[PDB]
């Protein structure tokens with residue numbers, strides 16, 4: 001039922017309905033000869049849509065917009081990128097050209113610039129300190145603290161009890177650390193516990209990469225990160 005790499009041709013995107021007015025988007029990218037899936041989120045905002053994260057590249061992100069307009073048929077008016085990596089900002093230029101207002105925290109925008117990645121236009125205030133939350137249309141944005149990256153945000157949809165962890169949260173099948181080049185291993189379990197404290201009622205938890213689950217994914221991620229810490 002949830003799509004994997006084997007169900008997604010190169011440069012295509014799939015939409016998966018999680019709950020009423022809430023979808024994930026799933027795309028793939030090839031890295032060093034292996035193929036990785038990646039998730040974002042789409043949340044209905046009345047008669048418009050809010051996008052969370054690009055689909056990891058210009059071509060994928062163009063495909064995403066085409067699939068949204070085919071399947072849902074409401075305008076994507078705003079996009080939020082949850083950290084500075086290319087799976088989150090890669091395609092911001094496509095979105096911007098298409099008339100989508102692109103947003104990220106000032107932390108994310110600065111780190112994207114340093115990496116020479118695409119840079120969302122707008123800055124999101126009110127997310128600079130661990131435990132900070134702001135409402136953005138139909139979602140709450142939450143800065144849990146440094147984890148996968150120092151700027152990583154999580155997104156909650158209160159209407160549907162959907163928690164989107166992005167790349168701060170690992171799927172259950174992931175048994176060893178992923179890309180930790182930009183991580184704060186020391187703080188990552190603390191940051192996960194802020195998430196648990198703030199969204200204990202979450203019914204659906206979506207990782208940045210791989211299969212949705214429940215709140216078990218939070219402790220799962222903590223285990224993996226602590227094991228890596230002790231490598």
Ligand SMILES: [Zn+2]
Nearest residue numbers: 083085148167
């Ligand atoms: Zn990342």
Ligand SMILES: [Zn+2]
Nearest residue numbers: 087167208209
């Ligand atoms: Zn990622």
